[PDB]
Curated annotation (Swiss-Prot):
Optimum temperature is above 90 degrees Celsius for S-sulfo-L-cysteine synthase activity, 70-80 degrees Celsius for O-acetylserine sulfhydrylase A activity, and 80 degrees Celsius for both cystathionine beta-synthase and L-serine sulfhdrylase activities. GO terms for biological process: cysteine biosynthetic process from serine. Optimum pH is 6.7 for O-acetylserine sulfhydrylase A activity and 8.1-8.8 for cystathionine beta-synthase activity. Homodimer. This is Protein CysO. Its cofactor is pyridoxal 5'-phosphate. InterPro entries: Cys_Synth/Cystath_Beta-Synth (IPR050214), P-phosphate_BS (IPR001216), TrpB-like_PALP (IPR001926), TrpB-like_PALP_sf (IPR036052). It comes from Aeropyrum pernix (strain ATCC 700893 / DSM 11879 / JCM 9820 / NBRC 100138 / K1).
């Protein structure tokens, strides 16, 4: 029998650790899920279904059910694109677009760009973990409460909008080097902002956020450590590459992206590799000494990419190379992408040039829009 999974989402407030993911992986590998005699007694299996994007669960004494039958492939978007509220727009106005580029790459590697600025609050991929993280709070943390985090810019913006839509107040901490939209937009949205001109990185801010947390008693939602970040990208970003690849007819051989928290690329790699372990994941390593906004080298400490059973290959990319790909995408497709999206395109071009990638379709996740990075654009032009 099928039941609406939304009735069972208290397991999100109670399952802990990664062991449920082993269910997630098996259901995706098999394309089906077994009936649950008593669903409430399998909290780990229920969370596994949620995280892969099921809207219905198979319940009682019955037969197995396919991904399709569980709602993994259901269309959520109203065709006419009319939405009764901003959060409903964020939730049903999905997938974000996936568009074939005209940019030519070596060795039969065909590029598709997944455009994450098509998210309504931050114009970035950060809307998704922010919505997921706030909605989990919303049943344990009293309204009017302050929530806070460290950010490079995007998450701070997404968190201020979302916090306010749910009745919370927000505070964001940013390092001196963050973009102006990051310092300014959260104030427009009603948040407090704290800029530390000392902090040479976002993660360098974290000990101060934690200390202020103990002193002032605000909720530190910690995007670097909060599992709802990874889960957001599982049922959203990663699921959508899967669905879009299968319904669009792509011969999907890999995805390429960048790493901040590692939330979205770990989800993408983990989900897609559950379905077909040979799908590659090509990830940006910003070259030593270069700053590509929003992103970091692997070895500076990242939760999901390290702890989860994920294959990937790294490619070195300088800020100059990232911006040169911004320029070439612009001239080739008329699409203006952010430096981190340029970096990913480039990392994929490099792996394509070395001959380690099968010919096929590859999805590059473009975290945000290049409109936000004018002085980087000015410099790339010279």
């Amino acid at each position: 029998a099928l039941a609406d999974i939304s009735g069972y989402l208290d397991v999100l407030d109670s399952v802990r650790g990664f062991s449920y993911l082993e269910n997630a992986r098996e259901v995706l590998r098999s394309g089906e899920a077994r009936c649950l005699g008593n669903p409430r007694s399998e909290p780990e299996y229920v969370k596994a279904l949620y995280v892969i994007g099921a809207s219905r669960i198979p319940v009682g004494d019955g037969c197995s059910h396919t991904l399709e039958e569980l709602g993994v492939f259901d269309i959520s978007v109203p065709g006419e694109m009319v939405f009764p509220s901003p959060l409903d727009f964020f939730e049903r106005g999905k997938p974000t677009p996936l568009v074939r580029s005209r940019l030519q790459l070596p060795n039969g590697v065909r590029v598709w760009l997944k455009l994450e600025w098509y998210n309504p609050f931050s114009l970035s991929v950060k809307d998704r973990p922010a919505v997921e993280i706030i909605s989990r709070l919303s049943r344990r943390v009293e309204k009017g409460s302050l929530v806070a985090d460290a950010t490079s810019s995007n998450f701070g913006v997404a968190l201020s909008a979302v916090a306010r839509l749910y009745g919370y107040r927000a505070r964001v901490y940013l390092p001196g080097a963050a973009e102006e939209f990051g310092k300014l937009l959260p104030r427009l949205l009603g948040a407090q902002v704290i800029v530390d001109p000392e902090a040479p990185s976002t993660v360098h801010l974290l000990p101060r956020v934690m200390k202020d947390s103990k002193n002032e008693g605000f909720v530190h939602v910690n995007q670097f450590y909060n599992d709802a970040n990874f889960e957001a990208h599982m049922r959203g970003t990663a699921r959508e590459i899967f669905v879009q690849s299968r319904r669009g007819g792509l011969a999907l051989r890999g995805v390429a992206g960048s790493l901040g928290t590692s939330g979205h690329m770990s989800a993408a790699a983990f989900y897609l590799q559950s379905v077909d372990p040979s799908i590659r994941a090509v990830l940006v390593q910003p070259a030593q000494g270069d700053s590509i906004p929003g992103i970091r080298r692997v070895e500076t400490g990242m939760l999901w990419i390290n702890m989860l059973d994920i294959s990937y290959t790294l490619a070195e990319v300088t800020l100059e190379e990232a911006m040169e790909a911004v320029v070439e995408v612009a001239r080739s497709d008329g699409l203006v992408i952010g430096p981190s999206g340029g970096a990913a395109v480039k990392a994929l071009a490099k792996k394509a040039a070395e001959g380690d990638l099968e010919p096929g379709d590859y999805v590059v996740v473009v975290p945000d829009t290049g409109f936000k990075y004018l002085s980087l654009v000015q410099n790339a032009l010279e």
